[PDB]
Amino acid sequence: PFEMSQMVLSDIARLRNMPDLAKRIESYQPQPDPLAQRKAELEIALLEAQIAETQSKAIENRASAGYKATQAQNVQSDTDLKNLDYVEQESGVKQARDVQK
Amino acid sequence: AGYKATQAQNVQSDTDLKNLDYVEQESGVKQARDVQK
Numbered sequence: 001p002f003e004m005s006q007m008v009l010s011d012i013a014r015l016r017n018m019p020d021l022a023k024r025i026e027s028y029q030p031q032p033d034p035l036a037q038r039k040a041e042l043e044i045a046l047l048e049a050q051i052a053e054t055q056s057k058a059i060e061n062r063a064s065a066g067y068k069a070t071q072a073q074n075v076q077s078d079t080d081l082k083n084l085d086y087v088e089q090e091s092g093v094k095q096a097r098d099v100q101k
Numbered sequence: 102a103g104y105k106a107t108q109a110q111n112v113q114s115d116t117d118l119k120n121l122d123y124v125e126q127e128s129g130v131k132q133a134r135d136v137q138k
Contacts, residue, residue: 073113077116077120078119
């Protein structure tokens with residue numbers, strides 16, 4: 001850490017008959033930039049947001065697969081109805097039913 | 102995802118109705134009901 005570098009630099013300055021420069025190098029306390037810490041916190045928050053968004057996307061994909069299976073079942077039922085109607089038309093059952101009424 | 106599950110449930114209900122209509126048509130229940138009126 002730079003704190004011990006401060007001690008070494010202050011000792012060098014004090015030994016070379018420059019005491020004022022040493023008292024500065026000693027009195028200097030470095031402070032972190034609040035903007036950088038804010039940026040790091042926002043980056044962490046954004047990363048968790050992307051994780052949540054990906055989880056929600058996977059859930060939506062599963063739901064879409066289920067609805068796309070239900071649609072296939074409904075299509076199969078519609079196909080069965082179409083086959084029944086075709087059989088009735090070919091065999092003349094519809095004509096007989098219409099004649100009856 | 103929730104709305105896409107609700108849609109699946111509605112599709113299942115529609116399929117049940119289609120099966121009921123197919124059974125009624127095959128068994129002639131619809132013809133009897135029409136004859137009654």
